[PDB]
């Protein structure tokens, strides 16, 4: 009756490279409980910044125990190995960990492996890291190598979307017109890009 | 217009710079009573700004760039509140001339210890874009 | 820019229409062999399109040939196209209009849209080429059945209830519409207006049907009872009514023209005499069909041996008429199933619609 | 309810004073048996009523002389229902409009005499009739009459169409009364047997 | 007991009548 | 009005109780559309237990505004009420229970009312089965023909 | 016309003897005993009939159809049943 | 502007600002403690005052601390003493204030509107000698 997920209280962001972007020379802010995590809702620690010049002023998504169970990234929620997502990942080379759907299932079964992690290590992709290293199989054919900053591109000026961004180039937001709505490539559900259930871009 | 808190006589020179504070005055009381909705949250508060730096430009060049106003007056329309006494120190420094306020250079107000953005010289801009600033809408004020 | 914004336009236009005067086309088809209506004849369909009432021995099939599907939402209204089987129309309630081959074919012949609320009621004209459709926003738009533009479109002071044709041949621009303020409208579309007015209705309009040609129409309201009226006259000398009805929802007419099917809200079916003595028989009654608050469709099948109700969940109730007695009952789908009409190509085939969005023939 | 004028003081050493529920009564703290008395007592919007019976009555005793005190029109005055509760603000209840120039004497109580009727002279005239429940402490009427009066006119959110008016204050728990303001003549003797009929 | 029964197979048919519609 | 009368037929006192329940027979005969059928029913119940008074007159007043009771809000619950009362009072009472439920049927078209009393008299409680009897032959006398 | 006037918020009615007509405390009631509802100082504060031509003589055909004297005899003449819903009129020319 | 925005807090282009205003329910107390140490006394006219203000406008508080010489202090409250004495002796009819000043549907008015733009009353003030209170 006393029990809870205890806080993502940690530095060292893990991130890819398309993320993390192109300057080696790089200013970075650190929130320390100003959100909670996105799958498991812990209160985790933000890390934002800018890595380039035409940004989103990007920042972490999920917790950082979340993304150390899945090995994918804080912000582009896609496996750091490959650039792959990890449904891609998980029908690649193994699919049986899954996870709860149901809240208190899931923040228990959450505070038994953030348990774990804490006995453990520290720096390890669970179990299925001895089960992982049998990769370039199929899935390196279509992995990508190269940072990606099309995905780091900022959000589209809904102003200009409907014709009435004022600011003009002085609008940070994208002064480009939108994709297709109707496109399920568009939908792309967070929680279904965690589970790797399903995901349109997998 | 302005309540006087000294409730005395003015000097000699204040009844010819007095119109200028006046539609100044009414310019602060325009951006006062403008609607804040359809432009931006912060965008509203830049004509405040600007406005007053304009005044306090005006005041620093009746005393500074023209010496066409007295000490005593001068002392007198700072303590009736018309001109910034620590924008027009910061204007007497070398490198900030074109100072828009006061605000713009406070390193707390950054959260990475800075200043604006309009403060850096333009041959050290190095993003391109309309550079505006936050703190009060101004346009490469280095 | 312009042609940016026209495109971005073009975006929300398409999520519009994912989220479902603008109407959209269905298929590729159009116009078949060298030009010819989708509604008229698909000249594809089994048996034969100018066939008579009784074609064969009815009796009750359980089998399913299209499940349609299009609509988004549970189709108000359920039609066919004039004389043949050779199209029918789904009026689907987010503000849709669908018809198809209705005859196994899975693609839809012509579509429409342009409303804002649910379409109530679904309705053509004699010849066949005109479509009114009745809505919740108290306006009913008559269009082409091939084209999917509206031709003319009506309003009303009062909601829009079940609007129907005129059986006359002279008579096909006039349409019957009911009125939520005890209203019965003879209005003709040539005039705009309506051209008779009838206020001796008591409540909301349900169902207005023609018990004889061009002689009197039964209309029948919120109350539990049917009153048939000349068309363009004042008085009305035919009412049926009784104490153990709450309502009478559904008001059909059977293909042989000797008895009225009434889909009463007692959970029965209320025979009523289609000759001069149009009394109703409580000995011939269907209360093996439960109808409570729920509209249906209690239809007839050929040569007055079938009769079919509907139930709110899901399960159809077959009855020979003829020996007077419910013969079988078709529970297929997990969706709610009012309205039904056997086909009057092929004695073995009915259409039905579902609350899940599909269209089923039987 | 039998000692309710001895409880209900004016002066208390702490106490916040509150008007009652559709009267206007006022209430130092929270005496729930008086409160219950007194709600059951004015139950069925009783003060309202209450205060436009005695409006429409003596509005129909002027409505009788009319024409002897020299009367073009007897106004009543269509007024919001919680006018008869409201105490911060005070429109006019009775609209006089004279048929001639009235000399109209000063501002002086209805039980003052010896009043000349030389101060002023106007057309127009207004009544106004307020409602208190005294105590025991406070049972005077006549000066919290004027004070009211004086209160009032000078008031620019109590509403009078004319300066010249009278303003009857009645207490209906000590079944006391009084009235101040200005008189024109062939009034007082009228008014002051008027309203005795109507306490009768 | 039968009572609780009677009531879970009139929620299940409420189930199916929810469903339905 | 009816609120305020509502405590008044809970008195002991016979002259208090006659006039009373002639004011509610003048009420319920005249005016129905002002009071609730939850009050009315309340009503009856308040009469069930001022059935039990020694005046035959304030019994007949009372079968009187059972009768216009079920003029008013018509007749199931107040003969579901009367059926439940007359089965539980089996003492020196209740036939003119049975008068009411007569008065009942017999202002409010028996044929409804006879099928609940026709079951009514499956219950094998010794005296309900007497009840009905009772109701049924002050019922025929009241009808006739 | 502002007449704000601080109020007694608490009204101290019976609910059980309100809406019943009975208090299970009765002497010992708490609140007071009383049957209303009225309104609060609060809830104050916020407070030839196709043809339309002229109509002369007319007559009523046996199946309730209003008409003229020479239409009634023309319609007589014409049909056995009315013009309003083709009833047993019976060729009723009578005023 | 900050004080003529945010009305009664109803536009969703504030809406997040809601946790900001929010979480100013620790500090009222100390806001009300320097607001009220800091009346302008009877003969002044207008007082005015540093204050800390937050950027959304939550709160205000006086960031000062009055401090008054001893026998300049006792000497001008013995003079606003003998003022008050004359006042009472020498008004002949005093009227009282209401309580409260505004009426509960009157609003907390704009200073901008109302009282920035007109010109303040005369204070206590006791004219002072030129030869003996040199
Ligand atoms: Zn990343
Ligand atoms: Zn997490
Ligand atoms: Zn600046
Ligand atoms: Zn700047
Ligand atoms: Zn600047
Ligand atoms: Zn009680």
């Known amino acids: ?202 | ?142 | ?362 | 309810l039998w000692w309710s004028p001895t409880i209900n003081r004016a002066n208390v050493y702490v106490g916040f004073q509150v008007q009652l529920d559709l009267t206007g009564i006022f209430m130092h703290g929270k005496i729930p048996t008086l409160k219950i008395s007194l709600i059951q007592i004015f139950r069925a919007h009783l003060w309202q009523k209450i205060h436009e019976s005695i409006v429409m009555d003596l509005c129909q005793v002027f409505d009788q002389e009319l024409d002897a005190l020299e009367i073009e029109t007897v106004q009543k005055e269509t007024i919001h229902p919680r006018k008869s509760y409201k105490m911060n603000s005070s429109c006019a209840d009775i609209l006089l409009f004279a048929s001639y120039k009235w000399n109209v004497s000063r501002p002086s109580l209805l039980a003052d005499s010896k009043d000349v009727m030389d101060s002023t002279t106007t057309q127009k005239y207004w009544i106004d009739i307020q409602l208190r429940w005294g105590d025991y402490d406070s049972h005077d009427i006549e000066r919290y009459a004027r004070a009211k009066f004086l209160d009032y006119t000078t008031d620019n959110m109590s509403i009078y169409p004319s300066p010249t008016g009278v303003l009857i204050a009645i207490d209906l728990a000590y079944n006391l009364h009084s009235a101040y303001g200005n008189w024109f003549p062939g009034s007082k003797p009228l008014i002051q047997q008027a309203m005795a009929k109507i306490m009768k | ?21 | 009005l009816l609120p305020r009368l509502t405590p008044i037929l809970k008195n002991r006192h016979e002259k208090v109780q006659e006039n009373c329940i002639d004011l509610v027979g003048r009420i319920a005969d005249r005016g129905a559309e002002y009071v609730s059928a939850r009050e009315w029913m309340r009503i009856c119940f308040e009469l069930l237990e001022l059935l039990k008074a020694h005046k035959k007159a304030i019994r007949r007043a009372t079968v009187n505004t059972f009768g216009y009771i079920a003029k008013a809000i018509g007749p199931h619950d107040v003969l579901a009420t009367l059926l439940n009362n007359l089965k539980v009072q089996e003492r020196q009472n209740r036939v003119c229970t049975t008068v009411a439920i007569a008065i009942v049927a017999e202002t409010c078209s028996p044929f409804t009312v006879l099928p609940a009393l026709m079951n009514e008299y499956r219950v094998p409680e010794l005296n309900v089965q007497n009840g009905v009897l009772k109701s049924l032959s002050f019922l025929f006398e009241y009808i006739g023909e | 016309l502002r007449a704000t006037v601080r109020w007694d918020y608490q009204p101290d009615i019976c609910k059980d003897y309100k809406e019943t007509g009975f208090c299970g405390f009765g002497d010992s009631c708490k609140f007071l005993h009383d049957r209303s509802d009225y309104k609060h100082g609060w809830q104050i504060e916020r407070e030839c009939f196709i043809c339309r031509q002229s109509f002369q003589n007319p007559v009523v055909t046996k199946c309730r159809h209003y008409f003229c004297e020479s239409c009634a005899l023309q319609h007589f003449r014409t049909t056995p049943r009315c013009y309003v819903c083709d009833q047993q009129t019976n060729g009723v020319f009578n005023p | ?134």
Not at chain 8, 86 to 105: A, G, I, V
Request: some cysteine.
């Open chain 5, 1 to 21: 007991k039968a009572r609780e029964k009677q009531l879970e197979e009139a929620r299940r048919l409420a189930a199916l009548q929810k469903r339905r519609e």
């Open chain 3, 1 to 362: 820019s312009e042609e940016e914004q026209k495109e971005l336009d073009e975006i929300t236009a398409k999520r519009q229409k994912k989220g479902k005067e603008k109407t959209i086309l269905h298929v590729k088809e159009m116009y078949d062999y060298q030009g010819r209506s989708y509604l008229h004849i698909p000249q594809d369909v089994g048996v034969n399109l100018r066939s008579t009432m009784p074609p064969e021995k009815c009796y009750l099939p359980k089998k399913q040939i299209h499940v349609w599907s299009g609509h988004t939402k549970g189709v108000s209204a359920v039609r066919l196209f004039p004389l043949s089987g050779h199209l029918l129309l789904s009026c689907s309630m987010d503000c849709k209009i669908k018809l198809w081959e209705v005859y196994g074919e899975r693609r839809c012949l012509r579509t429409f849209i342009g409303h804002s609320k649910a379409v109530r009621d679904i309705c053509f004209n004699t010849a066949g080429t005109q479509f009114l459709s009745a809505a919740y926003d108290r306006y009913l738009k008559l269009w082409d059945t091939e084209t999917g533009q509206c031709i003319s479109r009506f309003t009303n002071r009062k909601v829009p209830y079940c609007v129907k044709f005129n059986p006359d041949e002279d008579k096909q621009n006039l349409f019957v519409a009911g009125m939520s303020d005890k209203k019965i409208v003879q209005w003709d579309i040539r005039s705009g207006e309506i051209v008779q007015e009838y206020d001796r209705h008591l409540g909301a309009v349900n169902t207005i049907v023609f018990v004889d040609e061009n002689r009197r129409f039964v209309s029948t309201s919120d109350d539990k009872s049917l009153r048939v009226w000349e068309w363009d006259i004042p008085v009305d000398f035919k009412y049926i009514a009784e104490p153990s009805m709450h309502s009478m929802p559904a008001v059909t007419l059977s293909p042989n023209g000797k008895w009225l099917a009434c889909q009463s809200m007692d959970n029965q079916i209320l025979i009523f005499g289609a000759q001069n003595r149009f009394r109703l028989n409580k000995k011939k009654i269907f209360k093996g069909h439960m109808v409570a608050g729920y509209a249906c469709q209690v239809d007839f099948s050929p040569d007055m041996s079938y009769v079919i109700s509907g139930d709110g969940n899901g399960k159809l109730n077959i009855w020979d008429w003829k020996t007077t007695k419910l013969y079988s009952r078709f529970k297929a789908h997990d969706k709610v199933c009012i309205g039904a009409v056997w086909h009057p190509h092929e004695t073995s085939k009915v259409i039905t619609c579902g609350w899940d969005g599909l269209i089923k023939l039987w």
């Open chain 1, 1 to 202: 009756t006393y029990n809870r997920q205890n806080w993502e209280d940690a530095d060292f962001p893990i991130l890819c490279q398309t993320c993390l972007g192109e300057n080696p020379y790089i200013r970075m802010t650190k929130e320390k409980y100003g959100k909670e995590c996105k799958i498991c809702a812990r209160p985790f620690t933000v890390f934002r910044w800018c890595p380039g010049v035409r940004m989103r002023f990007k920042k972490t998504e999920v917790c950082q125990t979340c993304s150390k169970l899945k090995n994918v990234c804080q912000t582009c929620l896609l496996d750091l190995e490959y650039g792959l997502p990890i449904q891609v990942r998980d029908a690649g080379l193994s699919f049986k960990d899954d996870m709860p759907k149901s809240d208190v299932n899931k923040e228990y079964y959450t505070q038994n492996m953030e348990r774990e992690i804490s006995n453990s290590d520290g720096t390890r992709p669970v179990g299925m890291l001895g089960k992982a290293t049998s990769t370039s199989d199929m899935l390196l054919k279509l992995a990508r190598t190269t940072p990606y900053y099309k995905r780091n591109r900022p959000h589209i000026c809904s102003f200009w979307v409907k014709g009435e961004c004022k600011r003009g180039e002085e609008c940070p937001y994208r002064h480009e017109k939108p994709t297709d709505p109707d496109d399920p490539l568009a939908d792309q559900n967070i929680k279904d890009r965690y589970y790797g259930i399903n995901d349109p871009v997998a």
């Open chain 2, 1 to 142: 217009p302005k309540v006087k808190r000294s409730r005395k006589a003015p000097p000699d020179g204040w009844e010819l710079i007095e119109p200028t504070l006046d539609e100044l005055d009414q310019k602060m009381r325009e951006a006062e009573t403008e609607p804040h909705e359809g432009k931006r949250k912060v965008e509203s508060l830049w004509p405040i700004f600007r406005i007053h730096h304009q005044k306090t430009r005006y005041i620093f060049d009746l005393f500074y760039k023209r010496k066409a106003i007295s000490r005593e007056l001068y002392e007198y329309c700072i303590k009736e509140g018309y001109a910034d006494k620590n924008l027009i120190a910061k204007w007497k420094k070398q490198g900030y001339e074109n100072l828009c306020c006061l605000r713009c250079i406070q390193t707390r107000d950054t959260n990475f210890g800075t200043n604006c953005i309009c403060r850096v010289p333009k041959s050290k801009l190095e993003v391109g874009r309309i550079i505006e600033c936050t703190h009060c809408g101004c346009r490469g004020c280095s």
């Open chain 8, 1 to 134: 502007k900050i004080i003529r925005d945010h009305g009664d807090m109803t536009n969703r282009k504030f809406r997040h600002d809601k946790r900001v205003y929010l979480g100013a329910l620790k500090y009222m107390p100390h806001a009300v403690l320097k607001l009220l140490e800091n009346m302008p006394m009877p003969w002044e006219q207008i007082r005015d005052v540093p204050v800390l203000y937050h950027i959304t406008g939550a709160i205000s508080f006086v960031n000062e601390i009055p401090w008054v010489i001893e026998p300049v202090y006792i000497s001008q409250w013995g003079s606003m003493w003998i003022m008050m004495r004359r006042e009472k002796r020498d008004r002949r009819h005093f009227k009282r204030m209401r309580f409260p000043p505004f009426d509960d549907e009157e609003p907390p008015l704009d200073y901008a509107d109302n009282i920035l733009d007109v010109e303040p009353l005369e204070a206590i003030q006791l004219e002072l000698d030129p030869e003996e209170d040199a």
